[PDB]
Coordinates of N, CA, C and O in Angstrom, one line a residue:
Chain A
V1 N 95.9 148.0 111.6 CA 95.9 147.3 110.0 C 96.0 145.6 109.8 O 95.7 144.9 111.2
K2 N 95.5 145.2 108.7 CA 95.1 143.9 108.3 C 96.1 143.2 107.1 O 95.9 143.7 106.0
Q3 N 96.9 142.4 107.9 CA 98.2 141.8 106.2 C 98.2 140.5 106.5 O 97.6 140.0 107.3
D4 N 98.9 140.1 105.3 CA 99.0 138.4 105.4 C 100.3 138.4 106.1 O 101.4 138.6 105.9
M5 N 100.4 137.5 107.3 CA 101.6 137.0 108.3 C 101.2 136.1 109.3 O 99.7 135.4 109.3
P6 N 102.4 135.3 109.4 CA 102.1 134.0 110.4 C 101.3 134.5 111.5 O 101.4 135.5 112.0
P7 N 101.2 133.6 112.1 CA 100.8 133.8 113.7 C 101.8 133.8 114.7 O 103.1 133.9 114.3
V8 N 101.5 134.3 116.1 CA 102.5 134.4 116.8 C 103.3 133.3 117.4 O 104.1 133.1 117.3
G9 N 102.7 131.9 117.6 CA 103.4 130.7 117.4 C 104.4 130.3 116.1 O 104.6 128.8 116.4
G10 N 103.8 130.8 115.2 CA 104.2 130.5 113.8 C 103.5 128.8 113.1 O 102.1 128.7 114.1
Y11 N 103.8 128.5 112.3 CA 103.2 127.3 111.2 C 104.0 126.0 112.2 O 104.5 125.7 113.2
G12 N 103.3 124.8 111.7 CA 103.4 123.8 112.2 C 105.2 122.9 111.2 O 105.2 124.0 110.8
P13 N 105.1 122.0 111.5 CA 106.3 121.3 110.7 C 106.4 121.1 109.4 O 104.9 120.6 109.1
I14 N 107.2 121.1 108.5 CA 107.3 120.7 107.5 C 108.6 119.8 107.1 O 109.8 120.3 107.0
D15 N 107.9 118.7 106.3 CA 109.5 118.0 106.5 C 109.8 118.2 104.6 O 109.8 119.2 104.1
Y16 N 111.4 117.8 105.1 CA 112.5 118.1 103.7 C 113.3 116.6 103.7 O 114.4 117.2 102.8
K17 N 113.3 115.9 104.3 CA 114.0 114.5 104.0 C 113.5 113.7 103.6 O 111.9 113.6 103.4
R18 N 114.3 112.7 102.8 CA 114.1 111.4 101.6 C 113.9 110.6 102.5 O 114.8 110.4 104.2
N19 N 112.7 109.9 102.7 CA 112.2 109.0 103.5 C 111.8 107.5 102.5 O 110.4 107.9 101.9
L20 N 112.1 106.4 102.9 CA 112.3 105.6 102.6 C 112.2 104.5 103.4 O 113.4 104.3 104.0
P21 N 110.9 104.0 103.8 CA 110.4 103.0 104.9 C 111.5 101.6 104.7 O 111.8 100.9 106.0
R22 N 112.0 101.3 103.9 CA 113.2 100.0 103.7 C 112.0 98.5 104.4 O 112.2 98.2 105.1
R23 N 111.1 98.3 103.2 CA 109.7 97.2 103.4 C 110.1 96.3 102.8 O 110.6 96.2 102.0
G24 N 110.4 95.1 103.3 CA 110.1 93.7 102.9 C 111.4 92.9 104.0 O 111.6 92.9 104.8
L25 N 111.3 91.8 103.3 CA 112.3 90.6 104.2 C 113.8 90.5 103.9 O 114.3 90.9 102.6
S26 N 114.3 89.8 104.4 CA 115.9 89.9 104.2 C 116.2 88.3 102.9 O 115.3 87.6 102.5
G27 N 116.9 88.4 102.5 CA 117.5 87.6 101.1 C 117.1 86.0 101.6 O 116.7 85.3 100.3
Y28 N 117.9 85.5 102.6 CA 117.8 84.0 103.5 C 116.3 83.7 103.2 O 116.1 82.6 103.0
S29 N 115.2 84.6 104.1 CA 113.8 84.3 103.5 C 113.3 84.1 102.4 O 112.6 83.2 101.6
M30 N 113.7 84.8 101.2 CA 113.2 84.8 99.7 C 113.4 83.5 99.6 O 112.8 83.3 98.4
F31 N 115.0 83.2 99.5 CA 115.6 82.3 98.8 C 114.7 81.0 98.9 O 114.8 80.2 98.6
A32 N 115.0 81.0 100.8 CA 114.5 79.5 101.3 C 112.9 79.2 100.6 O 112.3 78.2 100.8
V33 N 112.0 80.6 100.5 CA 110.8 80.3 100.1 C 110.8 79.8 98.6 O 110.0 79.1 98.2
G34 N 111.7 80.5 97.7 CA 111.4 80.1 96.5 C 112.4 78.5 96.2 O 111.8 77.6 95.5
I35 N 113.5 77.9 97.5 CA 113.7 76.8 97.3 C 112.6 75.9 97.8 O 112.4 74.7 97.1
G36 N 111.7 76.0 98.6 CA 111.1 74.9 99.0 C 109.7 74.9 97.7 O 108.9 74.2 98.4
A37 N 109.4 76.4 97.5 CA 108.6 75.8 96.3 C 109.0 75.4 95.3 O 107.8 74.5 94.7
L38 N 110.2 75.6 94.5 CA 110.6 74.5 94.1 C 110.7 72.5 94.5 O 110.1 71.8 93.5
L39 N 111.0 72.5 95.6 CA 110.9 71.5 96.3 C 109.4 70.7 96.1 O 109.3 69.5 96.0
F40 N 108.5 71.4 96.1 CA 107.0 71.0 96.5 C 106.3 70.7 94.9 O 106.1 69.8 94.9
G41 N 107.2 71.3 94.2 CA 106.5 71.2 92.8 C 106.8 70.1 92.3 O 106.7 69.3 91.2
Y42 N 108.6 69.9 92.3 CA 109.1 69.1 91.7 C 108.6 67.5 92.8 O 108.4 66.4 91.8
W43 N 108.4 67.3 93.6 CA 107.5 66.4 94.4 C 106.4 66.0 93.7 O 105.9 64.8 93.2
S44 N 105.3 67.2 93.7 CA 104.0 66.7 93.1 C 104.3 66.2 91.3 O 103.2 65.4 91.0
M45 N 105.1 66.8 90.7 CA 105.5 66.7 89.6 C 105.9 65.3 89.1 O 105.6 64.2 88.6
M46 N 106.6 64.7 90.2 CA 107.4 63.3 90.2 C 106.5 62.4 90.5 O 105.8 61.2 89.7
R47 N 105.0 62.9 91.5 CA 103.6 62.1 91.1 C 102.9 61.7 90.3 O 102.8 60.6 89.6
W48 N 102.9 62.6 89.6 CA 101.9 62.9 88.5 C 102.3 62.4 87.2 O 101.9 62.0 86.4
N49 N 103.7 62.6 87.2 CA 104.3 61.7 85.9 C 104.4 60.6 86.0 O 104.6 59.9 85.1
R50 N 105.0 59.9 87.5 CA 104.6 58.2 87.7 C 103.3 57.7 87.7 O 103.5 57.0 86.6
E51 N 102.5 58.6 87.9 CA 101.0 58.0 87.6 C 100.5 58.0 86.3 O 99.9 56.9 85.4
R52 N 101.2 59.6 85.1 CA 100.9 58.9 83.9 C 101.3 58.0 82.6 O 100.9 57.5 82.1
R53 N 102.8 57.5 83.5 CA 103.6 56.5 82.6 C 102.8 55.1 83.2 O 102.9 54.9 81.9
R54 N 102.1 55.0 84.2 CA 101.5 53.9 84.2 C 100.2 54.0 83.7 O 99.8 52.8 82.7
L55 N 99.0 55.3 83.5 CA 98.1 55.3 82.7 C 98.6 54.8 81.1 O 97.7 54.1 80.1
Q56 N 100.0 55.5 80.5 CA 100.2 55.2 79.4 C 100.6 53.9 79.2 O 100.3 53.0 78.3
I57 N 101.1 52.8 80.2 CA 101.4 51.3 79.7 C 100.5 50.5 79.6 O 100.2 50.0 79.0
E58 N 99.2 51.0 80.7 CA 98.0 50.5 80.6 C 97.1 50.8 79.0 O 96.6 49.5 78.7
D59 N 97.5 51.9 78.5 CA 96.8 52.1 77.4 C 97.4 51.5 76.1 O 97.0 50.9 75.3
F60 N 99.0 51.2 76.1 CA 99.7 50.9 75.4 C 99.1 49.2 74.9 O 99.4 48.5 74.4
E61 N 99.2 48.8 76.6 CA 98.8 47.2 76.6 C 97.4 47.2 75.8 O 97.5 45.2 75.6
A62 N 96.7 47.7 76.4 CA 95.2 47.6 75.4 C 95.2 47.7 74.2 O 94.7 46.8 73.0
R63 N 96.6 48.7 73.7 CA 96.3 48.4 72.0 C 97.0 47.0 71.9 O 97.1 46.9 70.6
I64 N 97.9 46.4 72.3 CA 98.6 45.0 72.2 C 97.6 44.3 72.2 O 97.5 43.3 71.6
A65 N 97.0 44.4 72.7 CA 95.3 42.9 73.4 C 94.4 43.2 71.6 O 94.0 42.3 71.4
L66 N 94.8 44.5 71.2 CA 93.6 45.0 70.1 C 94.0 44.7 69.1 O 93.4 44.5 68.0
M67 N 95.1 44.8 68.7 CA 96.3 44.6 68.0 C 95.9 43.4 66.4 O 95.4 43.8 65.4
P68 N 95.7 42.2 66.8 CA 95.6 41.1 65.9 C 93.9 41.2 65.3 O 94.3 40.7 64.1
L69 N 92.9 41.1 65.8 CA 92.0 41.7 64.8 C 92.3 42.5 64.3 O 91.6 42.1 62.5
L70 N 92.9 43.6 64.1 CA 92.9 44.5 63.5 C 94.0 44.1 62.2 O 93.9 45.0 61.1
Chain B
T42 N 127.0 123.9 105.1 CA 126.1 124.5 104.4 C 126.1 123.3 102.9 O 125.6 124.2 102.2
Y43 N 126.7 122.6 103.2 CA 126.7 121.5 102.0 C 126.5 120.3 102.5 O 126.8 119.5 103.1
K44 N 126.3 119.2 101.7 CA 125.7 117.7 101.5 C 126.5 117.1 100.6 O 126.2 117.5 99.6
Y45 N 126.8 116.0 101.0 CA 127.8 115.0 100.1 C 126.5 114.0 99.0 O 126.2 113.2 99.5
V46 N 126.3 114.9 98.4 CA 124.3 113.7 97.7 C 125.6 112.3 96.9 O 126.6 112.9 95.9
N47 N 125.1 111.8 97.2 CA 125.4 110.2 96.2 C 126.6 110.0 96.5 O 127.7 110.0 95.6
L48 N 127.5 110.1 97.6 CA 129.3 109.7 98.4 C 128.6 108.5 98.8 O 129.7 107.8 99.3
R49 N 127.7 107.7 99.5 CA 127.7 106.8 100.2 C 128.5 105.2 99.6 O 128.1 104.7 98.4
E50 N 129.3 104.6 101.1 CA 129.5 103.8 100.4 C 129.2 102.2 100.6 O 128.2 102.6 102.0
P51 N 129.0 101.5 99.6 CA 128.0 99.9 100.3 C 129.0 99.1 100.9 O 130.0 99.5 100.9
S52 N 127.9 98.3 102.0 CA 128.5 97.6 102.9 C 129.2 96.4 101.8 O 129.4 96.2 100.9
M53 N 129.9 95.3 102.7 CA 130.7 94.2 102.2 C 130.3 92.9 103.0 O 130.3 91.8 102.7
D54 N 129.5 92.9 104.2 CA 129.0 91.7 104.7 C 128.5 90.9 104.2 O 127.6 90.8 103.2
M55 N 128.7 89.9 104.6 CA 127.8 88.3 103.8 C 126.2 88.4 103.6 O 125.5 88.1 102.7
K56 N 125.3 88.9 105.1 CA 123.7 88.9 105.3 C 123.4 90.4 104.1 O 122.5 90.1 103.3
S57 N 124.1 91.4 104.0 CA 124.1 92.4 102.9 C 124.4 92.2 101.6 O 123.1 92.5 100.7
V58 N 125.2 91.5 101.4 CA 125.5 90.9 100.1 C 124.5 89.9 99.8 O 124.0 90.1 98.3
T59 N 124.2 89.1 100.7 CA 123.2 88.0 99.9 C 121.9 89.0 99.8 O 121.1 88.9 99.1
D60 N 121.5 89.9 100.6 CA 120.3 90.8 100.4 C 120.1 91.3 99.0 O 119.3 91.4 98.2
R61 N 121.3 92.1 98.8 CA 121.6 92.9 97.5 C 121.5 91.6 96.3 O 120.7 92.2 95.1
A62 N 122.0 90.5 96.7 CA 122.0 89.6 95.6 C 120.7 88.9 95.4 O 120.1 88.6 94.1
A63 N 119.9 88.9 96.7 CA 118.1 88.8 96.3 C 117.6 89.4 95.9 O 116.4 89.6 95.0
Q64 N 117.7 91.0 95.9 CA 117.3 91.7 95.2 C 117.6 92.4 93.4 O 116.3 92.6 92.7
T65 N 119.0 91.2 93.4 CA 119.2 91.1 92.0 C 118.5 90.4 91.8 O 117.8 90.6 90.3
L66 N 118.6 89.1 91.9 CA 117.6 87.5 90.9 C 116.0 88.1 91.4 O 115.9 87.1 90.6
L67 N 115.7 88.7 91.7 CA 114.0 88.5 92.1 C 113.7 90.3 92.1 O 112.2 90.1 91.8
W68 N 114.2 91.0 92.1 CA 113.9 92.5 91.6 C 112.5 93.0 92.8 O 111.6 93.3 92.4
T69 N 113.2 93.6 93.7 CA 112.4 94.3 94.7 C 112.2 95.3 94.4 O 110.6 95.6 94.5
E70 N 112.8 96.1 93.9 CA 112.4 97.7 93.5 C 111.7 97.7 92.3 O 110.6 98.5 92.4
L71 N 111.5 96.8 91.8 CA 110.6 96.9 90.4 C 109.3 96.5 91.4 O 108.1 97.2 90.6
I72 N 109.0 95.6 92.0 CA 108.0 95.3 93.1 C 107.8 96.7 93.5 O 106.2 96.8 93.6
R73 N 108.0 97.3 94.1 CA 108.3 98.6 94.7 C 107.3 99.6 93.7 O 106.5 100.5 94.2
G74 N 108.0 100.0 92.8 CA 107.4 100.8 91.5 C 106.0 100.2 91.4 O 105.2 101.1 90.9
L75 N 105.6 98.7 91.4 CA 104.7 98.3 91.0 C 103.2 98.6 91.8 O 102.2 99.0 91.5
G76 N 104.1 99.0 93.4 CA 102.9 99.0 94.5 C 103.2 100.2 94.9 O 101.5 100.6 95.0
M77 N 103.7 101.0 94.3 CA 103.5 102.4 94.2 C 101.9 102.6 93.0 O 101.1 104.1 93.3
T78 N 102.4 102.2 91.6 CA 101.5 102.4 90.8 C 99.9 102.0 91.2 O 98.6 102.6 91.2
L79 N 100.3 100.7 92.0 CA 98.6 99.6 92.4 C 98.2 100.6 93.3 O 96.9 100.9 93.0
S80 N 99.1 101.5 94.2 CA 98.2 101.9 95.2 C 97.9 104.3 94.8 O 96.6 104.2 94.6
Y81 N 98.4 104.2 93.3 CA 97.7 105.6 92.9 C 96.8 104.8 91.9 O 96.0 106.1 91.7
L82 N 96.6 103.6 91.8 CA 95.3 103.1 91.1 C 93.9 103.5 92.0 O 92.7 103.6 91.6
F83 N 93.8 103.5 93.5 CA 93.0 103.6 93.9 C 92.9 104.8 95.0 O 92.1 104.5 95.6
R84 N 93.0 105.6 94.4 CA 92.7 107.7 94.7 C 92.1 108.0 94.2 O 91.5 107.5 93.1
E85 N 91.4 108.9 94.8 CA 90.5 109.9 93.9 C 90.7 110.8 92.8 O 91.9 111.6 93.0
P86 N 90.9 110.2 91.3 CA 91.3 111.3 90.8 C 91.3 112.5 90.7 O 89.5 112.9 90.9
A87 N 91.8 114.0 90.4 CA 92.2 115.2 90.7 C 91.2 115.7 89.2 O 91.2 116.9 89.1
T88 N 90.4 114.6 88.1 CA 90.2 115.4 87.2 C 88.6 116.3 87.4 O 87.6 115.4 88.2
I89 N 88.0 117.2 87.1 CA 87.2 117.7 87.1 C 86.0 117.4 85.9 O 86.8 117.6 85.1
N90 N 84.9 118.0 85.9 CA 83.8 117.9 85.2 C 83.8 119.1 84.2 O 82.5 119.6 84.6
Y91 N 84.7 119.0 83.1 CA 84.0 120.6 82.6 C 83.2 120.5 81.4 O 83.3 119.0 80.6
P92 N 82.3 120.7 81.2 CA 81.9 122.7 81.4 C 81.0 122.2 82.6 O 80.7 123.8 83.1
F93 N 80.8 121.0 83.4 CA 79.8 121.3 84.2 C 80.7 122.1 85.3 O 80.2 122.3 86.9
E94 N 81.8 121.8 85.7 CA 82.9 121.7 87.0 C 84.0 122.6 86.6 O 84.9 122.1 86.8
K95 N 83.9 123.9 86.6 CA 84.9 124.7 86.3 C 86.3 125.1 87.2 O 85.7 124.7 88.6
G96 N 87.2 125.3 87.4 CA 88.2 125.6 87.8 C 88.3 126.3 89.1 O 87.4 126.9 88.2
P97 N 88.5 126.3 90.3 CA 88.8 127.3 90.9 C 89.4 128.7 90.6 O 90.7 128.7 89.4
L98 N 89.0 130.2 90.6 CA 89.8 131.1 90.3 C 89.6 132.1 91.4 O 89.5 131.9 92.4
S99 N 90.2 133.6 91.4 CA 90.6 134.6 92.0 C 89.9 135.7 91.5 O 89.7 136.1 90.6
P100 N 89.5 136.8 92.5 CA 89.1 137.9 92.0 C 89.9 138.6 91.1 O 89.3 139.8 90.7
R101 N 91.3 138.8 90.9 CA 92.1 139.1 90.7 C 92.3 138.8 89.1 O 92.9 139.6 88.5
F102 N 91.7 138.0 88.9 CA 91.6 136.9 87.2 C 91.8 138.1 86.2 O 90.6 139.1 86.4
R103 N 92.3 137.9 85.4 CA 92.6 139.1 84.0 C 92.4 138.1 82.6 O 92.4 137.3 82.7
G104 N 91.0 139.0 82.2 CA 90.7 138.0 81.1 C 89.9 139.1 79.9 O 90.8 140.4 79.4
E105 N 88.8 139.4 79.4 CA 88.5 139.9 78.6 C 88.2 141.2 79.0 O 88.3 141.3 80.2
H106 N 88.7 142.1 78.5 CA 88.6 143.4 78.3 C 86.9 144.2 78.4 O 86.7 143.9 77.7
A107 N 86.7 145.4 79.2 CA 85.7 145.9 79.1 C 85.5 147.5 79.7 O 86.5 147.9 80.2
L108 N 84.3 147.7 79.6 CA 84.7 150.0 80.1 C 83.3 149.9 81.2 O 82.2 149.4 80.4
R109 N 83.7 150.3 81.7 CA 82.7 150.5 82.8 C 81.7 151.7 82.3 O 82.1 152.5 81.9

């Protein structure tokens, strides 16, 4: 006879359980990364803002020099 | 013969509380969902090109009637 049957040793394994691998970093790591990014941004902003203030002072004194003729 | 779905008690220690607070303030599982959509973006779509690519059938299929 010929029918639809499983083999002698059966079929392979079949999963039925929830699989969540829990990928990622701990909270301390991401918080430290954020704090370091904030500090780097603050330092770069302080340097560029001081330079921009000096440039603005230079332009203002240029206007001071040009004022009496106008 | 039964299992207690959704009865797990959350932890209390400082490292796990800090992890949960970091997930709250930085939205980790939303990034997980974004990553799953990004994974599904790079797969082969299962769309066949009808009418040039008919779907698979069986010899037992029931359709239009005929007289032999």
